[PDB]
Amino acid sequence: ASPFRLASAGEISEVQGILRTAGLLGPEKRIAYLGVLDPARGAGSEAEDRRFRVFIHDVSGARPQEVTVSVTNGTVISAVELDTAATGELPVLEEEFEVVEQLLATDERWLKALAARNLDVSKVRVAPLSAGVFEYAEERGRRILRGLAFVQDFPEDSAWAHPVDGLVAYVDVVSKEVTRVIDTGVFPVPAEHGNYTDPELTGPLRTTQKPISITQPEGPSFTVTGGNHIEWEKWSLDVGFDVREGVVLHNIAFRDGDRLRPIINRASIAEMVVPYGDPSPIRSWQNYFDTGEYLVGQYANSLELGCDCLGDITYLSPVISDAFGNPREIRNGICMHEEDWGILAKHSDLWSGINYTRRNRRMVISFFTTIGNYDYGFYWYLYLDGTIEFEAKATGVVFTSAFPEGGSDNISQLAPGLGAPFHQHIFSARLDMAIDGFTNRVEEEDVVRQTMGPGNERGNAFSRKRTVLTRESEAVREADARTGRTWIISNPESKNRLNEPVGYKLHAHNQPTLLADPGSSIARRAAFATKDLWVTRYADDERYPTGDFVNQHSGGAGLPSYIAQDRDIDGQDIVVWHTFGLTHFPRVEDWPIMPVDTVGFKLRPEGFFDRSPVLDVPAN
Amino acid sequence: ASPFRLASAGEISEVQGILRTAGLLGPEKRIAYLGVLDPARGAGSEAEDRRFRVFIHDVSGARPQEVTVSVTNGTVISAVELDTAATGELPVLEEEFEVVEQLLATDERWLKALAARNLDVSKVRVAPLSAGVFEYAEERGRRILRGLAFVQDFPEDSAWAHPVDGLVAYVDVVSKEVTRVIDTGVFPVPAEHGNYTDPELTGPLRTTQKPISITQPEGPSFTVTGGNHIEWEKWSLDVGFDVREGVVLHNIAFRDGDRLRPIINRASIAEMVVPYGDPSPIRSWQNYFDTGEYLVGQYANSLELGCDCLGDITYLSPVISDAFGNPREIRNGICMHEEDWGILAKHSDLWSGINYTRRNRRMVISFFTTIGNYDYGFYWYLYLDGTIEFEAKATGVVFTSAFPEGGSDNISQLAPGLGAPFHQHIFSARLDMAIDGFTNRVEEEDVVRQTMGPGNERGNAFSRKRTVLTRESEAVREADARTGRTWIISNPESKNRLNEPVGYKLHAHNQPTLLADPGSSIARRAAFATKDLWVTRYADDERYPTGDFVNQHSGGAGLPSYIAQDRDIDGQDIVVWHTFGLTHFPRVEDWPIMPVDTVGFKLRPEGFFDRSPVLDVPAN
Ligand SMILES: [Cu+2]
Ligand SMILES: [Cu+2]
């Protein structure tokens, strides 16, 4: 019954039928993106209109289309031809991954480059990398991927240990032509393998690790009804899944006594950018938007019990569409479990003689995705005390290059002759706020140091100041760790028993934002990543900080375009976009496969409750 | 056999015998501090000299003494009379806690102040607060505590809910005189109780939490030999305990193949300061050094299985001396266990077809201490991948005041009429570094942004720079979160297989440091807390960032005194002191007992290993 249920196999089939019947899905067509649309503001219209948005690629070269279907009434609502030279190409198709390698295996420039290196073309793998927008005027309106090559000594060899430097090719995947091959020169191919399952590398495995058994003999404290509605320790929410964004949290709310109080209307990681800081022309174009360009949801892993998720695990298996409109199930694609989280509260009082201790717990919702050499885990946590936290776990295999003779300022050496360019992984959290409802405002809170003098005779005083962000034109904010800067999202029309607005505080990690020059191409296309915090007025079509079609878009779409409307945000339906990420200078310990590193953010209540919300937690 | 074993009951008894026999411990004497001394640099002298340092208070008013004993040869090594007016008073004695309240219960100014408020003196509790050094010239050389009063309606009432504002008294605890009583005016006493076990406040307890069972059916993967020597997953260390510092880690080292490689010689939280930012003369003097002034080790909790520590717990029960030299055991004062820590490393490769997943684990060493209204957990974690992390968990009951009518800039309101002054909790980690041995150096590493131009034509390049700290006079460093500033501790004479110095990277949280005016008294006494990172040359007597006698010392001792020697630190036996802490603007949710908040730091290897050190972790 819930308009927020996961798409089913049946719904995607019905979308396939509707598109076919309408003549929109013939044999030369491909679904580049399919996803359910959220209900509009005001679901008072009884019975839901389950609508779906679709991007349809045309392999014969005709113009792509954006189509919206209503599977409830079984009709096409709208269909728009897209001009990709203006508004960006469609997301990369999975079936275009291999096209880059097979085209190059019969191009004479590529074979010439490999012959110069004594490389067997049947051992050379080519990574299908997104192209971006640079100084190649001929790439306008064309669907282009770029190729970087890695040698694979045998079918189970880790190709990342053998980068083929000085060589890159550009490929038109629709007309199937190799547009350019660039050969800046010969670099030795690093010969050491990086096979982390080879006993020569690993040595004998440890026998010292004894098991840890985490069980819940009575089962878990949460309940799933309606496929994806979660109730856990006063928390209530719906777990969605989008092939582009991955796991989406809807209707996050908290049962405060008898009233169900909204906190967040919709939470997602709406974009991901990985810019590389190597100035070598072989890689200076290299940036990936894994979310916008590749869609991280469609690369979700199946997570195995006792390996990926440990404990009493409840699984969800989301359904997505393949390139032809057939439903594809991602088995065990989402993990949900609760886990112990140490001491929640503790005091032993000298005067009353009472000793008090309570344990904390958190609810975990996670999925893991793989894009080429990179693996990323997305973790949402809910805590007993009302804290909401997001954590990204970055692992996998670092992207490699040759290590130049005589060193580099932008590459680190992991192995003889083997380099790993410097880069960042930068995320955009989109938080459609609904703190006790939709009348919200954002305040910037700074620590205030005070001077020794009258009224502060001992020089011990300090304070704070809050600055209300009133219009979008003033709501592009920078971190300031030195003054403890945080941001408070409050509802000015909902007060707690002390007559103050209820609120939640956003705690950032204050990592560096985008390091690229502000005149570069990537600063233009990843403009959200240049600032820590943006606030916009809610609007149905403003969904991604980079716009709808990120692939090969020239820049400026998304957030800097939304912000320019200078709308009123002081007590309105607002959206918070938080940029955060990792700056990765690769270390020897990241090789041949890298241990997890993390980054994220959290929100804690700030006078949302009338007292501590965990006074009713038992002792156990 | 280990010189690093915990002091036993027998050793403390023998110290009591030695002091008595030497005439140093008659009936008017009190042990204010007793602790084992670490071995000197160069333990090549066979058979250890177990030595103990003692501070002896004299209740009759004679000068205190610092005494060092050798329990191996059963002799006093040295005994120094202390001039406390010059070098600071001894740590607060536990038996002086109640003296402040009992003296005031018969002083006529105090009874007059209570009668004006209609308060029954038998219901008024008085907190024994350290005095600091301010503008009261008569306090020089005297042992003084300050008193703030809280009303307790019944023996099990939480007194913190009823602060008696506008009233403070100073008390000479040796001569047992009340030196001053100050009454700035009458504030209503907040009447709402804060009894978090009263069913009226809590409501009915939740019944929705089902159990989580964490067991190790084969027992734990670590082993304890010799009382306190830990071996776990290639880590090796000794767990010490000092009545002042609490848990101390010694000889942290890592088994890299067949060689045991040192990382840290000694790790401790060497000081703790809690400054208050309320300018009201009733509290503008209020700062506590819980470590230096009260000794947090002697207030360690006994931790209960399944409440404080959950899982297969191994306990240590350290032994300390009471005020008369009798051994006192802190039963279950230290918890040690391993716990699951999610994914360690993960990759699914498209080209080789290999899917790889490994779990992370961490070793936990923790104790919990209670000082008055505050409770703090100290957690040391060791990870499979060589990461070392420290985490402080702050909880307990906030320190309260009246909330003035018409508001405050330095106090937040938690309940009608109930205020909680702004304050910080600031820690000093002392890390006696030994990265592959004792020849170490510290580099400051900043991100370097690069300008669009020749050699960087696309404006994507970025880099880093490392600045070697060579003399102590240049080794007082500030955080800079904006440029990703970190610090690397390396051994310039120990290289990895890539011929680079082996190293460890210190990752700070970049929270604000001390906010008080730089001319204030607390900026003088807590000078370490004004900067993020200090590096000194090792010396046996430079142990605390505040000096040996913090109680009522006028300032400047410790780190600014050590730094002035301007010693050479480029490739030497060095010590790293990291300041970090929380700035606490209390929230309604912190009342009536506050959920844990955390802060800390971590160190990760930086080219210490020749590749990932967890290639040999099995699948399980
Ligand atoms: Cu990376
Ligand atoms: Cu606090």
- Which chain B residues are within 8 Å of A125, Cβ to Cβ? 351
DSSP string of A47-92? S---EEEEEEEETTSPPPEEEEEETTTTEEEEEEE--HHHH-PPPP
Cβ pair A212:B609 closer than 8 A: no
Q: Provide the shortest C-alpha distance from residue B395 to chain A (in Å).
A: 6
- Which chain B residues are within 8 Å of A614, Cβ to Cβ? 595
Residue of chain A whose Cα is closest to the Cα of B283:
A460
Instruction: Provide the 3-class DSSP secondary structure of residue A42.
Output: coil
User: How far apart are the C-alpha atoms of A144 and A175, rounded to whole Å?
Assistant: 10
Q: Could you tell me which residues of B are annotated as the binding site for substrate?
A: 288-299, 371-376
Cβ pair A447:B583 closer than 8 A: yes
User: How far apart are the C-alpha atoms of B480 and A481, rounded to whole Å?
Assistant: 8
Give the method of determination.
X-ray
Contact predicate B579/B532, CB 8 Å: yes
Q: For chain A, what percentages of helix, strand and coil (3-state, to nearest 5) are there? A: 15, 40, 45
Span A94-195 CATH architecture: Roll (3.10)
DSSP state of B63: P
C-alpha distances in angstroms, B364 versus A15, A168, A454, B138, B261?
53, 48, 48, 48, 21
Interface mutation target, options A192, A215, A343, A457, chain B, most CBs of B under 10 Å: A343
Q: Provide the shortest C-alpha distance from residue A150 to chain B (in Å).
A: 10
User: Which residue type does B345 have?
Assistant: A
Cβ pair A209:B301 closer than 8 A: no
Q: Which residues surround ligand 2, an ion (CB under 5 A)?
A: B 584
Considering just the CA atoms, what is the radius of gyration of chain A in Å?
A: 26
Find residues 511-540 of chain B whose CB sits inside 8 Å of chain A. Answer: 511-512, 515-517, 519-523
Q: Note the ligand closest to the C-alpha atom of B422.
A: 2
Interface mutation target, options A349, A488, A583, chain B, most CBs of B under 10 Å: A349
Q: A135: Cβ–Cβ under 8 A, 6 or more apart, which residues?
A: none
Q: Count how many Cα atoms sit within 13 Å of the Cα of residue A457 in the half-sphere of its side chain.
A: 8
Strand partners, B261: B254
User: How far apart are the C-alpha atoms of B316 and B6, rounded to whole Å?
Assistant: 10
Report how far ligand 1's centroid is from the alpha carbon of A398 (Å).
6
Report how far ligand 2's centroid is from the alpha carbon of A307 (Å).
39
CATH 2.30.40.10, applies to B1-87:
no
User: How far apart are the C-alpha atoms of A267 and A435, rounded to whole Å?
Assistant: 13
Q: Provide the shortest C-alpha distance from residue A280 to chain B (in Å).
A: 8
Contact predicate A513/A480, CB 8 Å: no
CATH fold of A196-619: Beta-galactosidase; Chain A, domain 5 (2.70.98)
The β-bridge relationship of strands B213-215 and A213-215 is antiparallel
Cβ pair A583:B484 closer than 8 A: yes
β-sheet with B65-70: strand ranges across:
B29-36, B51-58, B65-70, B75-81
Q: Could you tell me which residues of B are annotated as the binding site?
A: 288-299, 371-376, 423, 425, 584
Instruction: Provide the 3-class DSSP secondary structure of residue A590.
Output: helix
Assess whether the region B94-195 and the region B196-619 belong to the same CATH fold. Answer: no
Considering just the CA atoms, what is the radius of gyration of chain B in Å?
A: 26
Cβ pair A512:B590 closer than 8 A: no
Cβ pair A481:B483 closer than 8 A: no
Nearest in space to B428 (alpha carbons), one of B543, B333, B507, B318: B543
User: How far apart are the C-alpha atoms of B265 and B252, rounded to whole Å?
Assistant: 6
Dihedral sign computed on CA atoms, order A67, A68, A71, A73: negative
Contact predicate B493/B587, CB 8 Å: no
User: How far apart are the C-alpha atoms of A232 and B210, rounded to whole Å?
Assistant: 11
User: Which residue type does A253 have?
Assistant: A
Cβ pair A219:B209 closer than 8 A: no
Whether B379 is catalytic is: no
Element (H, E) at A388: strand A388-396
Burial (Cβ within 10 Å: 0-12, 13-18, ≥19) of residue A81: exposed
Q: For residue A165, how many other CB atoms are within 10 A of its CB?
A: 25
Cβ pair B397:A608 closer than 8 A: no
User: How far apart are the C-alpha atoms of B364 and B335, rounded to whole Å?
Assistant: 8
DSSP state of A291: I
Contact predicate A338/A310, CB 8 Å: no
Phi, psi of B398 (to 5 degrees): -65, 150
User: How far apart are the C-alpha atoms of A313 and B492, rounded to whole Å?
Assistant: 48
Report how far ligand 2's centroid is from the alpha carbon of A495 (Å).
24
C-alpha distances in angstroms, B302 versus B97, B108, B331, B594?
21, 40, 6, 20
Contact predicate A101/A522, CB 8 Å: no
Q: Provide the shortest C-alpha distance from residue B485 to chain A (in Å).
A: 10
Residue of chain B whose Cα is closest to the Cα of A354:
B156
Q: Count how many Cα atoms sit within 13 Å of the Cα of residue B189 in the half-sphere of its side chain.
A: 22
Burial (Cβ within 10 Å: 0-12, 13-18, ≥19) of residue A598: middle
Report how far ligand 1's centroid is from the alpha carbon of A421 (Å).
9
**Ranges of each domain in chain B:** 1-87, 94-195, 196-619
User: Which residue type does B92 have?
Assistant: V
Q: Which two tokens stand for residue B199?
A: 């069913």
Strand partners, A338: A363
String of b and e for A555-587 (b: at least 16 CB within 10 Å)? bebbbbebbeeebebebbbbbbbbbbbbbbbbb
Report how far ligand 2's centroid is from the alpha carbon of B243 (Å).
23
Alpha-carbon dihedral of residues B450, A516, A130, A556, nearest 10 degrees? Answer: -140
Q: Please tell me which residue in A38, A165, A242, A290 is annotated as part of the active site.
A: A290
User: How far apart are the C-alpha atoms of B72 and B15, rounded to whole Å?
Assistant: 10
User: How far apart are the C-alpha atoms of A330 and B235, rounded to whole Å?
Assistant: 40
Q: Which two tokens stand for residue A17?
A: 């039928």
Q: Please tell me which residue in B374, B379, B538, B562 is annotated as part of the active site.
A: B374
User: How far apart are the C-alpha atoms of B125 and B38, rounded to whole Å?
Assistant: 40
Whether B290 is catalytic is: yes
Q: Please tell me which residue in A374, A379, A538, A544 is annotated as part of the active site.
A: A374
Cβ pair B594:A345 closer than 8 A: yes
Find residues 177-236 of chain A whose CB sits inside 8 Å of chain B. Answer: 196-197, 201-221, 233
C-alpha distances in angstroms, A608 versus A432, A470, A495?
18, 21, 8
Report how far ligand 2's centroid is from the alpha carbon of B376 (Å).
10
- Which chain B residues are within 8 Å of A592, Cβ to Cβ? 611-612, 615
Cβ pair A589:B511 closer than 8 A: no
Q: Does B619 touch chain A (CB under 8 A)?
A: yes
Find residues 370-409 of chain A whose CB sits inside 8 Å of chain B. Answer: 370, 372-373, 375, 377, 385-386, 393, 395-397, 409
C-alpha distances in angstroms, A31 versus A57, A543, A552?
6, 20, 18
- Which chain B residues are within 8 Å of A338, Cβ to Cβ? 212
Residue of chain B whose Cα is closest to the Cα of A515:
B449
Q: Note the ligand closest to the C-alpha atom of A426.
A: 1
Q: Could you tell me which residues of B are annotated as the binding site for Cu cation?
A: 423, 425, 584
Report how far ligand 2's centroid is from the alpha carbon of B75 (Å).
45
User: How far apart are the C-alpha atoms of A77 and A10, rounded to whole Å?
Assistant: 19
Element (H, E) at B10: helix B9-21
Contact predicate B231/B222, CB 8 Å: yes
Cβ pair A588:B614 closer than 8 A: no
| Peptide bond preceding B592 in cis form (omega within 30 of 0) | yes
β-sheet with B167-172: strand ranges across:
B124-130, B144-151, B167-172, B177-183
Q: What would the 3-class secondary structure string for B40-93 be?
A: CCCCCCCCCCCEEEEEEEECCCCCCEEEEEECCCCEEEEEEECCHHHHCCCCCC
Cβ pair A422:B462 closer than 8 A: yes
Residue of chain A whose Cα is closest to the Cα of B484:
A512
- Which chain B residues are within 8 Å of A461, Cβ to Cβ? 277-279, 284, 410
Nearest in space to A444 (alpha carbons), one of A517, A372, A503, A518: A503
Contact predicate A573/A375, CB 8 Å: no
Contact predicate B450/B456, CB 8 Å: yes
